[PDB]
Amino acid sequence: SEPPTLALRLKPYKTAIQQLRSVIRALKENTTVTFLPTPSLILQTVRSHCVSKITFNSSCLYITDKSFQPKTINNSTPLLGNFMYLTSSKDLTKFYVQDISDLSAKISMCAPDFNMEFSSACVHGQDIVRESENSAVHVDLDFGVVADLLKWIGPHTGTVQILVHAGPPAIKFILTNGSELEFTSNNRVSFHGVKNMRINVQLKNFYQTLLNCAVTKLPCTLRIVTEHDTLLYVASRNGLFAVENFLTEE
Amino acid sequence: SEPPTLALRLKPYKTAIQQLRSVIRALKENTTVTFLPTPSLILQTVRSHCVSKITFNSSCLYITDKSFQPKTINNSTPLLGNFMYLTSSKDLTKFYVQDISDLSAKISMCAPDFNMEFSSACVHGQDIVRESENSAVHVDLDFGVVADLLKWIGPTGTVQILVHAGPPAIKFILTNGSELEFTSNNRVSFHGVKNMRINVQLKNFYQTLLNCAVTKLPCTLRIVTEHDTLLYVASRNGLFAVENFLTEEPF
């Protein structure tokens, strides 16, 4: 009778997008929203050498029928504009996606004397970057430390080089001007395996990577993967979502 | 279209809301949208002693079935926000309203790979202010005269509109003193006049002229003395009509 349905649980979902107000507003037209039957909801923004991804905890999602097929639509929607931003309305009383067609997702949203329904074309030909769980250098950073890096890059623009040292453990951040901000192994930075590795990434993709993780106001886990090409991984999460970023060398 | 359907003709409608972009964006949460089977679409904003109304020409509408019941909703929509502003999308490809429930209006909108429909509750405690075709004073003003009045009120206050009978003259006095008055010439037409005085808030009067100025055509000023001394200021074009209704202030 009814089609496969993926509903959002609004008490956790509405607290997550309020925490994400800053990021939800600065998405651009390169941003996809993917619905999976895990259940999972994934926001992805792909760019030149950077990929950021926000994954809502299954805590926020409820799925009717696991034969729901994966849907990926654009966030920039032909009449409503910013789809995610429009789910941050505080009037929202019901929010679910149905799998009617193989070509489109049907989204339903309610408010007190209002109900809307729309259908966006599915994008077939988009992938979602995954954390390779192999990592050569793995470094946890205090949220206080992340605020320090933010306040130190807050006038951008340039390039940043991230060096990580073995004995003793330390992570250092050198800028194209010269300025260096280093942290040593204390109680604000944990080192899960830091032999000697270095990456070079665009400074504003690193700065924006930090703004995304800072929305959780918790620790971030920074890593350096040496697989295909030296990839910088920067992630933070809370009990409602997880922010992941993937930057490659310049 | 089994249920009665009121469709918009997008070529004329899209050009009408583009002329109206200044008005569409400054509507507030007191603003009503009315769909009639005339066919007609009406934006009404009621305020203290001013009522402004924008009526889209029937030329902009196409109606299926005249048993479409009159629907009035709020322009301030619970998740989309400004309803009229969202019809101003240049991505819009299809826009019609259907009468399914007595309790709500069902609006459908399409764009290239997109199609939505929503239903907002209809409000029933509101009427549409009408032009009483009685008028004691009826004075048409060339758009030049209206542009002149605008470029003189831009800098609270109670403008008073005094009109003389023999011969015709209309005068606009401010609380400071300055007066801009005009005699029967080529840019002011005088049909019906009477020795009359009205006082209206200057802020509602200036905005009334800003709304009519959007047509860049003549404006029709009137003063109705049927129930209560009302100032009426209107300008139409081939796509819509801007009407304003001002009353005097109480002691």
UniProtKB/Swiss-Prot annotation, chain A:
Keyword Ubl conjugation: yes
Keywords carried by this UniProt record: DNA replication, DNA-binding, Host nucleus, Host-virus interaction, Inhibition of host innate immune response by virus, Inhibition of host IRF3 by virus, Inhibition of host NF-kappa-B by virus, Inhibition of host RLR pathway by virus, Isopeptide bond, Phosphoprotein, Ubl conjugation, Viral DNA replication, Viral immunoevasion, Virion
GO biological process, one term: symbiont-mediated suppression of host cytoplasmic pattern recognition receptor signaling pathway via inhibition of IRF3 activity
Domain of life per record: Viruses
UniProt PTM comment: Phosphorylated by UL97 on serine residues, phosphorylation seems important for UL44 nuclear entry but does not directly affect its role in replication. Sumoylated.
Subcellular location: Virion; Host nucleus
Entry GO CC: host cell nucleus; virion component
Signal peptide as annotated in the record: none
Transmembrane segments: none
MF-aspect GO terms: DNA binding; DNA polymerase processivity factor activity
Biological role stated in the UniProt entry: Accessory subunit of the DNA polymerase that plays an essential role in viral DNA replication and acts by increasing the processivity of polymerization. Forms dimers that binds to double-stranded DNA and UL54 specifically to stimulates long chain DNA synthesis efficiently. Plays an important role in maintaining the structure of viral replication compartments by interacting with host nucleolin/NUC. In addition, suppresses innate immune responses through effects on host IRF3 and NF-kappa-B.
Family of the protein in this entry: Belongs to the herpesviridae polymerase accessory protein family.
Subunit structure, as described in the record: Forms homodimers. Interacts with host SMARCB1. Interacts with host NCL/nucleolin; this interaction is important for the organization of proteins within viral replication compartments. Interacts with UL112/UL113; this interaction is necessary for efficient viral DNA replication. Interacts with UL84. Interacts with the uracil DNA glycosylase UL114. Interacts with the DNA polymerase catalytic subunit UL54. Interacts with host IRF3. Interacts with host RELA.
Description of its domains: The C-terminal region is required for viral DNA synthesis.
Protein's name in the database: DNA polymerase processivity factor
Organism whose genome encodes this protein: Human cytomegalovirus (strain AD169)
Gene transcribed to yield this protein: UL44
